[PDB]
Amino acid sequence: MNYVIIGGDAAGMSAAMQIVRNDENANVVTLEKGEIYSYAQCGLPYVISGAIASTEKLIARNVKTFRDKYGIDAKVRHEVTKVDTEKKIVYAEHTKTKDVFEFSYDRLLIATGVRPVMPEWEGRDLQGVHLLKTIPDAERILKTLETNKVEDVTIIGGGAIGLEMAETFVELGKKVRMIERNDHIGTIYDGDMAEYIYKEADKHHIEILTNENVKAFKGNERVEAVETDKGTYKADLVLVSVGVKPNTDFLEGTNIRTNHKGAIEVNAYMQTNVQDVYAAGDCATHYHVIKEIHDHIPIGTTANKQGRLAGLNMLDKRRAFKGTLGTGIIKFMNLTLARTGLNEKEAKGLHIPYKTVKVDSTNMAGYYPNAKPLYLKLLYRSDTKQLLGGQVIGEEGVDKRIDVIAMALFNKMSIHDLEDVDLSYAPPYNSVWDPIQQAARRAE
Amino acid sequence: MNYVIIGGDAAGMSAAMQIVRNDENANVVTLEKGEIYSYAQCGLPYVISGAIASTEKLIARNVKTFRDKYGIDAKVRHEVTKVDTEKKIVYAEHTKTKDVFEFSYDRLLIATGVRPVMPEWEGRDLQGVHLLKTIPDAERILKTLETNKVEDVTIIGGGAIGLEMAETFVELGKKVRMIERNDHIGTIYDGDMAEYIYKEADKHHIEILTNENVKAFKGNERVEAVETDKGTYKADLVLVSVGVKPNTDFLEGTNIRTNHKGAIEVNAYMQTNVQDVYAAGDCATHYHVIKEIHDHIPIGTTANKQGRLAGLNMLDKRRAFKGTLGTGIIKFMNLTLARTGLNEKEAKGLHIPYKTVKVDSTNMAGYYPNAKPLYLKLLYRSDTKQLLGGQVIGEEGVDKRIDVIAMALFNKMSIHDLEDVDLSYAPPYNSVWDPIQQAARRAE
Numbered sequence: 001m002n003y004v005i006i007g008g009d010a011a012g013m014s015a016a017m018q019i020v021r022n023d024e025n026a027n028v029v030t031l032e033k034g035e036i037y038s039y040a041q042c043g044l045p046y047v048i049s050g051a052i053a054s055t056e057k058l059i060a061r062n063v064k065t066f067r068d069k070y071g072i073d074a075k076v077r078h079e080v081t082k083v084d085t086e087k088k089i090v091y092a093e094h095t096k097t098k099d100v101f102e103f104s105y106d107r108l109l110i111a112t113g114v115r116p117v118m119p120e121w122e123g124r125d126l127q128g129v130h131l132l133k134t135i136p137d138a139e140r141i142l143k144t145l146e147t148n149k150v151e152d153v154t155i156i157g158g159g160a161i162g163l164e165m166a167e168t169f170v171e172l173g174k175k176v177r178m179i180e181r182n183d184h185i186g187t188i189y190d191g192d193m194a195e196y197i198y199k200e201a202d203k204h205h206i207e208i209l210t211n212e213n214v215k216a217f218k219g220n221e222r223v224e225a226v227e228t229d230k231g232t233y234k235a236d237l238v239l240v241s242v243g244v245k246p247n248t249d250f251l252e253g254t255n256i257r258t259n260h261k262g263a264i265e266v267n268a269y270m271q272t273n274v275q276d277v278y279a280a281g282d283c284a285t286h287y288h289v290i291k292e293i294h295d296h297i298p299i300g301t302t303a304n305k306q307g308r309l310a311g312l313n314m315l316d317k318r319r320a321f322k323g324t325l326g327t328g329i330i331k332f333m334n335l336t337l338a339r340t341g342l343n344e345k346e347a348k349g350l351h352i353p354y355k356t357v358k359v360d361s362t363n364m365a366g367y368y369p370n371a372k373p374l375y376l377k378l379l380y381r382s383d384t385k386q387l388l389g390g391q392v393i394g395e396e397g398v399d400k401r402i403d404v405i406a407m408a409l410f411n412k413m414s415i416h417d418l419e420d421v422d423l424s425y426a427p428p429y430n431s432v433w434d435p436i437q438q439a440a441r442r443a444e
Numbered sequence: 445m446n447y448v449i450i451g452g453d454a455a456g457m458s459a460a461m462q463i464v465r466n467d468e469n470a471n472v473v474t475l476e477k478g479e480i481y482s483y484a485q486c487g488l489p490y491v492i493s494g495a496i497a498s499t500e501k502l503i504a505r506n507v508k509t510f511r512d513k514y515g516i517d518a519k520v521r522h523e524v525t526k527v528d529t530e531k532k533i534v535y536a537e538h539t540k541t542k543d544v545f546e547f548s549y550d551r552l553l554i555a556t557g558v559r560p561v562m563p564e565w566e567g568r569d570l571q572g573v574h575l576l577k578t579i580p581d582a583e584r585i586l587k588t589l590e591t592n593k594v595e596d597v598t599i600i601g602g603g604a605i606g607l608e609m610a611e612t613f614v615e616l617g618k619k620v621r622m623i624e625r626n627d628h629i630g631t632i633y634d635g636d637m638a639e640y641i642y643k644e645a646d647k648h649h650i651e652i653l654t655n656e657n658v659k660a661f662k663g664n665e666r667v668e669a670v671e672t673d674k675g676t677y678k679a680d681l682v683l684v685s686v687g688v689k690p691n692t693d694f695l696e697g698t699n700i701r702t703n704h705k706g707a708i709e710v711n712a713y714m715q716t717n718v719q720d721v722y723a724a725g726d727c728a729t730h731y732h733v734i735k736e737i738h739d740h741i742p743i744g745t746t747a748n749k750q751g752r753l754a755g756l757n758m759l760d761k762r763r764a765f766k767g768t769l770g771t772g773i774i775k776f777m778n779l780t781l782a783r784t785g786l787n788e789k790e791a792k793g794l795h796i797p798y799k800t801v802k803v804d805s806t807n808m809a810g811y812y813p814n815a816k817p818l819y820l821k822l823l824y825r826s827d828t829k830q831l832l833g834g835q836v837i838g839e840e841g842v843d844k845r846i847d848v849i850a851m852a853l854f855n856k857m858s859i860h861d862l863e864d865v866d867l868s869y870a871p872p873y874n875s876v877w878d879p880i881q882q883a884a885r886r887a888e
């Protein structure tokens with residue numbers, strides 16, 4: 001009867017909705033550290049660009065709706081500081097009054113997600129230096145753009161947020177610099193595919209600095225320059241975009257197993273090693289369909305899927321999580337960047353014998369007007385020909401191809417089986433053989 | 445050593461390429477009735493609209509290449525009138541000189557496709573009455589549009605060609621009427637999905653006449669009117685697009701088995717019941733993955749796949765055709781119309797117990813600008829929940845959804861298994877749950 005959920009977003013509320021719909025008698029307490037429930041973090045870069053009117057448009061479901069319509073005891077400003085798994089008590093500190101509140105549970109879900117990482121650089125706390133995770137985070141970025149005269153913008157880290165925010169700031173008309181400590185931006189992509197990302201960024205006059213290490217942020221009350229090991233550069237706004245960390249530190253003292261990055265280990269049923277404690281979303285581990293191992297690939301699709309499943313399993317409606325494929329898709333200027341399954345570094349690290357096929361193709365019939373280039377790469381096992389992963393880059397029809405590849409990986413298809421699938425063709429949408437099929441035909 | 449192929453397009457030449465690549469000692473003779481090899485029939489409507497420069501842009505590989513580069517004895521203007529399967533001789537008539545040539549085979553492939561049907565209406569031979577199949581057919585339509593004052597166009601038959609050519613004629617600024625003997629245009633769609641087709645046509649001022657039967661075409665030399673059982677209407681150009689018939693009449697007297705419509709029955713290996721005689725493409729039957737019987741769904745994707753497989757099997761590189769799903773996609777004005785697997789009429793005619801789910805959704809995140817409506821319907825087995833079919837209609841993202849559904853059907857997935865697939869999400873491409881997955885969740 002007593003369900004407690006820590007975290008009031010994708011994984012947490014997906015679980016809450018399951019419990020509420022499938023048990024009329026349940027007492028559901030959800031504990032949220034912030035003031036905002038069920039909101040779309042994915043839309044934040046597009047609010048900051050001005051493409052979306054305001055952050056209000058990103059709220060999927062109000063806390064008032066959760067309380068009045070679904071009878072969930074949804075708490076805001078309740079930060080969980082510790083859990084006693086023997087007594088089955090959750091301790092939450094009110095973020096403003098600092099008052100401490102106890103919540104006894106029969107079953108507990110941890111759905112605290114991840115937080116962005118800020119390294120211990122000098123200048124960390126300078127005005128105009130920003131992380132991006134929450135709605136207040138985006139408002140603070142908008143506040144800087146509103147009050148300051150922003151011309152030069154520097155982004156540290158060339159992963160998912162870095163890439164999307166590089167677009168956002170270019171669209172806002174700023175001079176954009178990206179600094180990455182690795183060999184290239186779009187680190188999940190293989191060296192060969194990443195060249196297309198670099199080209200697109202260069203095309204829009206984004207300065208890319210690679211194998212370069214941030215030293216400090218210099219400035220007065222506010223950030224003025226980013227210092228690195230190779231130079232000092234003017235920056236009116238700095239976005240720090242260097243990765244994330246599971247919000248699981250408050251579990252120190254429990255016997256709850258975590259991986260090396262602090263992600264909570266879960267079995268097929270979203271259960272931790274501690275009786276009646278569950279975890280879901282970005283704070284938990286994610287079984288990988290292809291790796292056959294628990295990975296950590298924090299993403300919104302997986303968070304919702306895991307949250308829904310945790311809720312179901314907490315009700316003893318037993319259902320296994322089938323896993324992640326590491327699917328990811330990004331809009332980057334005029335390019336769509338998509339990947340799923342293993343890249344070459346992942347396959348190598350696993351000692352899986354693999355081969356690759358790469359095709360420079362078009363999204364649709366070559367003779368049809370405004371047919372655009374499509375670059376597609378597949379990895380497959382050299383012995384069994386099992387499809388392992390894909391990377392697709394292009395202006396159009398990239399999401400379609402990565403979704404088809406994802407379906408193939410999910411069903412453990414051989415690369416040559418792709419040739420036999422009755423995919424759709426008309427001139428405005430595809431070629432008579434899809435690029436995926438033409439790649440498959442090239443495979444050994 | 446002696447391979448003979450009848451028909452020089454998609455299925456025939458896919459076969460020819462396989463044989464030539466996988467047997468240097470092969471003597472490949474291909475016999476084509478017309479003057480044009482390997483061309484894209486799919487691009488015909490877009491040549492007529494003027495979207496594509498000319499019909500020359502539709503040739504994939506010309507006869508000179510086949511002859512010079514690949515060593516295929518590719519014959520033009522050779523119409524096969526008879527096959528003696530006992531003596532293993534193909535008899536062909538030169539279409540100009542009418543002289544008779546014979547060709548000895550070790551293995552034979554029939555790849556003669558289908559022809560458009562012209563019912564025996566009075567005035568069917570009038571100038572301005574057109575069928576659409578070949579490049580010359582398209583040039584004859586362009587001849588009428590050029591040399592004659594065309595303002596009113598009547599299309600008979602509301603299927604694939606009728607729908608695409610309605611767009612073409614509207615885009616050319618004509619007053620378009622289409623006449624269907626059935627209850628609605630886009631007959632393969634269920635009644636409820638067909639409503640979206642009617643709305644789009646109505647929006648663009650296409651007169652749709654339903655349950656109406658053409659009886660004659662009126663005029664002196666040219667058409668000036670179409671007579672029906674419900675009236676007589678002015679028409680300066682008439683397109684007859686009422687279906688197709690397999691080009692298999694010349695086989696009467698061979699023992700080669702055909703279905704009721706005249707399509708050549710083939711086994712898994714593209715083999716007929718007659719030793720060393722093969723068939724592929726639109727002239728052949730198509731094993732249906734879901735129906736589990738041999739169907740006839742003539743389409744370019746299937747023709748290439750079967751052509752390729754016939755070539756391979758004629759070399760004794762044994763490989764089974766896995767089947768068709770009945771996948772089809774059509775651009776219709778502002779709409780994209782896609783279907784795959786079973787519709788309700790098919791499921792009913794097969795006595796497969798089924799249920800449906802229909803979702804009115806968006807192609808991408810609802811909060812993202814220019815998110816467009818997406819209408820999606822799934823059929824699934826009542827007992828096992830096996831996915832059976834899908835229909836998707838919308839302005840954007842329809843091809844992606846039907847390809848995912850096709851992949852699911854190919855792998856015999858349960859409808860609820862769709863919930864577990866790590867499909868891609870970013871706001872410009874999808875919602876955090878894809879519409880297919882939301883539909884799947886609604887299923888019983």
Ligand SMILES: Cc1cc2nc3c(=O)[nH]c(=O)nc-3n(C[C@H](O)[C@H](O)[C@H](O)COP(=O)(O)OP(=O)(O)OC[C@H]3O[C@@H](n4cnc5c(N)ncnc54)[C@H](O)[C@@H]3O)c2cc1C
Nearest residue numbers: 007009010011033041042080112113281282299300303870
């Ligand atoms: C800029 C940006 C763009 C993104 N774009 C995409 C995209 O395009 N596609 C996609 O699939 N994903 C995207 N994501 C990722 C996606 O938004 C997240 O993976 C998803 O929100 C994770 O859901 P969750 O419920 O596990 O964690 P969260 O959504 O982070 O929810 C965790 C909640 O727990 C609360 N919490 C933390 N600690 C405590 C505590 N001690 N006590 C009480 N409450 C606590 C937090 O306040 C937070 O609200 C994006 C993320 C960002 C930041």
Ligand SMILES: Cc1cc2nc3c(=O)[nH]c(=O)nc-3n(C[C@H](O)[C@H](O)[C@H](O)COP(=O)(O)OP(=O)(O)OC[C@H]3O[C@@H](n4cnc5c(N)ncnc54)[C@H](O)[C@@H]3O)c2cc1C
Nearest residue numbers: 426451453454455477485486524556557725726743744747
């Ligand atoms: C307007 C139009 C649009 C289309 N759009 C699409 C689409 O968007 N997507 C899609 O997948 N499909 C589409 N198709 C269908 C696709 O083009 C065909 O299914 C494909 O061409 C079939 O290939 P085939 O080799 O079996 O038959 P065909 O391409 O018709 O080839 C048969 C050949 O055999 C020859 N022949 C016939 N009889 C004899 C004989 N007795 N002796 C010698 N030669 C003979 C014919 O001249 C012909 O060249 C479209 C078709 C049309 C007409």
Ligand SMILES: CC(C)(COP(=O)(O)OP(=O)(O)OC[C@H]1O[C@@H](n2cnc3c(N)ncnc32)[C@H](O)[C@@H]1OP(=O)(O)O)[C@@H](O)C(=O)NCCC(=O)NCCS
Nearest residue numbers: 432441442453454457458461482483484485486504505744
């Ligand atoms: C044009 C046509 C002859 C193509 O034949 P095809 O065999 O499919 O294509 P190609 O001859 O280019 O050869 C492709 C093969 O070469 C291989 N290949 C192509 N480029 C390669 C490369 N760069 N490196 C390695 N291999 C390559 C492919 O793997 C493929 O191998 P497979 O045949 O063993 O699977 C045939 O499709 C046709 O006649 N079509 C008519 C037009 C049409 O399709 N109409 C219907 C439209 S609706």
Ligand SMILES: CC(C)(COP(=O)(O)OP(=O)(O)OC[C@H]1O[C@@H](n2cnc3c(N)ncnc32)[C@H](O)[C@@H]1OP(=O)(O)O)[C@@H](O)C(=O)NCCC(=O)NCCS
Nearest residue numbers: 009010013014017038039040041042060061300876885886
């Ligand atoms: C908003 C949120 C609470 C949605 O919860 P949800 O349970 O997925 O969705 P709903 O509460 O609308 O309920 C959906 C259920 O109702 C059913 N349903 C919905 N509409 C229906 C209809 N018209 N007819 C019949 N059934 C319907 C569905 O079948 C589904 O059933 P299931 O849960 O048993 O599979 C949750 O996703 C969330 O908190 N999200 C945060 C925002 C987010 O997604 N962020 C990450 C972005 S990267």
Ligand SMILES: NC(=O)C1=CN([C@@H]2O[C@H](COP(=O)(O)OP(=O)(O)OC[C@H]3O[C@@H](n4cnc5c(N)ncnc54)[C@H](OP(=O)(O)O)[C@@H]3O)[C@@H](O)[C@H]2O)C=CC1
Nearest residue numbers: 157158159160161162180181187241242243298299329870
């Ligand atoms: N469309 C989508 O799928 C989107 C998803 N997201 C979500 O947000 C999460 C986090 O995004 P993000 O913050 O970009 O994290 P990412 O891991 O995606 O990117 C961080 C990048 O910064 C690099 N980096 C680390 N330290 C430094 C440093 N000191 N100097 C320069 N570069 C450094 C990392 O390299 P290294 O490997 O060496 O650490 C990595 O390449 C994602 O996992 C995803 O869940 C966000 C936006 C869009």
Ligand SMILES: NC(=O)C1=CN([C@@H]2O[C@H](COP(=O)(O)OP(=O)(O)OC[C@H]3O[C@@H](n4cnc5c(N)ncnc54)[C@H](OP(=O)(O)O)[C@@H]3O)[C@@H](O)[C@H]2O)C=CC1
Nearest residue numbers: 426601602603604605606624625631685686687742743773
């Ligand atoms: N994008 C794509 O997938 C495209 C594919 N094609 C290919 O071309 C082939 C043939 O297309 P098409 O010619 O349109 O054939 P279709 O079967 O697609 O459509 C013909 C329609 O005309 C109807 N009809 C039959 N007789 C009459 C009549 N006397 N009066 C009015 N309507 C009548 C048929 O109904 P009924 O069922 O009762 O006979 C049917 O609805 C397709 O099978 C496909 O292979 C062509 C264009 C686009």
